[PDB]
């Protein structure tokens, strides 16, 4: 037999002590609370081959945590749910920048390496649409995909200008043009009037990459 909780799987050969390093959310204080409920020591085993321990094991141990859930997955959703609504914190988890107002001109290195939740949660989303293409190409897309969605909302005056230029030659020439996704992954752009004073980048509507990759006149630029 077995018993599952918090995404960890229990059996009658386990040792409830050495689950400490493994489970995600239950280090020290909770086990003390738990062994108070079992009325036993750390050194004793809370599990045995006899059924009395097993049913007693499950009845107590279910009260702490709701069944068929985890803490790890709950954590990532509370992160993605922020970026899922197009929030400020949504970007800073994605790019690798700090969240808590921490500075950037000198030191944000521990964010760029450790925080990797929202990133991996998007690679799986890209596979659900654009298949099992290798990762570094997929990275080019949803980076390029969010950017236009930002410029569409926040800087709407600029998106329209990128949209207008595309549609003029569309009716007149019927010639080919291209999209520089590899330029948009790094954040480079084109197609408006600046204060300083064929390919297009920004004028699309969201989800456009689905429209073109998976249906001659238009040709994609992923790599270089």
């Amino acid at each position: 037999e077995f018993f599952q909780l918090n995404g960890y799987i229990f059996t009658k050969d386990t040792e409830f002590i050495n689950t400490k390093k493994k489970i995600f959310g239950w280090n020290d204080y909770t086990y003390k609370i738990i062994y108070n409920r079992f009325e036993k020591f750390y050194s004793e085993n809370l599990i045995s081959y006899k059924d009395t321990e097993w049913k007693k094991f499950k009845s107590i141990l279910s009260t702490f945590f709701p069944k068929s859930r985890s803490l790890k997955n709950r954590m990532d959703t509370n992160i993605f749910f922020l970026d899922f609504l197009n929030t400020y914190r949504g970007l800073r988890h994605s790019k690798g920048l700090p969240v808590r107002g921490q500075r950037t001109w000198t030191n944000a290195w521990s964010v760029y390496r450790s925080n990797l939740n929202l990133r991996k949660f998007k690679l799986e989303i890209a596979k659900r649409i654009y298949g099992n293409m290798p990762t570094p190409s997929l990275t080019t897309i949803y980076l390029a995909e969010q950017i236009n969605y930002i410029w569409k909302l926040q800087w709407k005056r600029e998106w329209l200008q990128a949209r207008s230029k595309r549609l003029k030659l569309m009716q007149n020439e019927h010639a080919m043009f291209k999209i520089d996704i590899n330029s948009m992954s790094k954040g480079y752009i084109d197609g408006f009037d600046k204060k300083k004073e064929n390919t297009f980048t920004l004028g699309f509507e969201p989800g456009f990459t689905l429209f073109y990759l998976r249906p001659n006149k238009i040709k994609i630029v992923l790599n270089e």
Partner: protein, 87 residues
Amino acid sequence: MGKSHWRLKYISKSIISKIIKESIGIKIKKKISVIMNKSSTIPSSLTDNTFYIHKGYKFRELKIKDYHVGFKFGEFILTRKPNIFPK
């Protein structure tokens, strides 16, 4: 993170004026849709409504939905245009 729950959420003079104008049925319009004081929380009555939020020298647009409730206006808007080192 946020404030303690008992420290009730902030809604300024303005939005309290707007919530009443909703209550009368007065529709939202050019100036009434305008928003300032971003720290004011995003109330619940004003679902199904557009509000042109202010930053700098221009504005941003959004609609309210039940998921957007509870948050702050300024957490959906970007002020500082991102920085990219050129080639």
